[PDB]
Amino acid sequence: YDETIATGTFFYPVPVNPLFACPEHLASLRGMTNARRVLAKMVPPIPP
Amino acid sequence: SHRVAFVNNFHMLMYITTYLGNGELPEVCINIYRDLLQHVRALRQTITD
Amino acid sequence: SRVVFDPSNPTTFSVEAIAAYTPVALIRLLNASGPLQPGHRVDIADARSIYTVGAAASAARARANHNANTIRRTAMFAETDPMTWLRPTVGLKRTFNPRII
Amino acid sequence: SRVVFDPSNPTTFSVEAIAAYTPVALIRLLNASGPLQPGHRVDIADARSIYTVGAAASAARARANHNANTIRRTAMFAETDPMTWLRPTVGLKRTFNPRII
Numbered sequence: 293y294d295e296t297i298a299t300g301t302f303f304y305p306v307p308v309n310p311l312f313a314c315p316e317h318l319a320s321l322r323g324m325t326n327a328r329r330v331l332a333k334m335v336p337p338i339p340p
Numbered sequence: 341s342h343r344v345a346f347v348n349n350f351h352m353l354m355y356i357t358t359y360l361g362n363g364e365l366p367e368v369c370i371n372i373y374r375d376l377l378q379h380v381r382a383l384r385q386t387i388t389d
Numbered sequence: 390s391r392v393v394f395d396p397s398n399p400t401t402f403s404v405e406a407i408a409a410y411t412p413v414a415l416i417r418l419l420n421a422s423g424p425l426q427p428g429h430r431v432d433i434a435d436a437r438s439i440y441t442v443g444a445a446a447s448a449a450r451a452r453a454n455h456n457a458n459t460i461r462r463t464a465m466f467a468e469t470d471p472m473t474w475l476r477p478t479v480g481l482k483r484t485f486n487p488r489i490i
Numbered sequence: 491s492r493v494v495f496d497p498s499n500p501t502t503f504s505v506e507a508i509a510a511y512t513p514v515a516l517i518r519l520l521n522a523s524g525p526l527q528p529g530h531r532v533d534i535a536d537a538r539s540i541y542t543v544g545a546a547a548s549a550a551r552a553r554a555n556h557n558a559n560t561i562r563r564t565a566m567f568a569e570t571d572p573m574t575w576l577r578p579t580v581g582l583k584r585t586f587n588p589r590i591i
Contacts, residue, residue, distance in 0.1 A: 293358050296480040298467040359482065471522035472494065475541060 308338050344372050353377065393419055395427040396436055404443025409451045412444065459487035494520060496528040497537055505544025510552045513545065560588035 305317040313336035318324060346352040353373050361370060391407060392398035393416070404412065429436050463481050470478035492508060493499035494517065505513065530537055564582050571579035 293354060295466055296359075296482070298477070301467070301477050364484065471520060472517065472524065475494070475517060475538065 306339070307336075310336050310338070313337065344369055391415070394423055396423075396429045396433060397427055399436060399440060401439050401443035401446065404440065405446040405450070407443075407447060409444075409447050412447065455487075458489050460485065460489060492516070495524050497524075497530045497534060498528055500537060500541065502540050502544035502547065505541070506547040506551065508544075508548060510548050513548065556588075559590050561586065561590065 300320045300322060303320065305314055305321055307313050315333045318329065318332055318337065346356070353376060357373050357377060390398065391403045462483065465480040465483060467478050467480050491499065492504045566581040566584060568579050568581055
């Protein structure tokens with residue numbers, strides 16, 4: 293909710309941990325839909 | 341009178357916290373707003389829990 | 390001239406020439422007696438709205454005069470830049486004073 | 491000269507001659523329209539990299555100007571001394587003001 297600076301201007305989420313996961317920080321990534329959000333809300337998104 | 345204002349609308353405390361959150365206001369009012377926001381978020385977390 | 394008694398007189402054309410403070414003092418003195426015979430059959434609230442845009446023009450003139458010493462305002466949000474590809478862009482919080490010298 | 495419209499124009503050769511504040515003002519006033527016909531087929535981000543090293547050179551220019559009143563910096567760590575055998579060597583915490591007189 294901070295429109296002073298664009299989202300993802302200098303950072304982009306890429307977490308690899310069941311502990312350091314972030315179901316909310318993924319909004320800073322480009323190309324994010326509602327379906328990908330509800331899917332990541334349950335299962336922690338970790339790339340293989 | 342030691343009283344917070346602009347409580348009627350919901351689209352006021354979020355703007356206040358997002359903009360006047362670096363120390364423009366005294367430490368008290370910003371803390372009151374942050375506590376309200378945290379309580380609402382805890383309610384949402386209880387719902388999803 | 391702007392004479393609110395006959396509703397055909399007050400119009401935004403003359404309010405612009407009128408200043409910001411004098412119309413308030415003008416309306417204050419004018420008596421309650423308004424001639425019923427002249428009257429806008431065009432929803433006189435339109436003349437009220439005409440009074441609003443007229444006062445808005447008068448206020449704009451006062452700010453333009455006040456704009457001699459102020460500082461030019463910029464965009465308070467990001468993503469508004471001709472060539473963002475060179476470097477990123479940020480907004481600006483208007484927490485300054487317009488006084489320059 | 492430095493004209494970011496034609497990508498072949500901007501280069502670090504001219505940015506050094508440009509000051510520190512004026513290029514920021516320069517980029518601000520230039521329009522978004524950039525001619526597509528000229529373009530670096532050499533990974534234009536290198537021109538971005540060229541823009542960085544050019545701005546770094548301009549900052550170094552303003553640095554040498556400000557360096558007239560500053561104090562010469564020394565080593566902040568130990569073990570750095572020509573003849574340590576005479577006496578030991580210590581660093582220095584840079585917690586001063588460059589103002590001299």
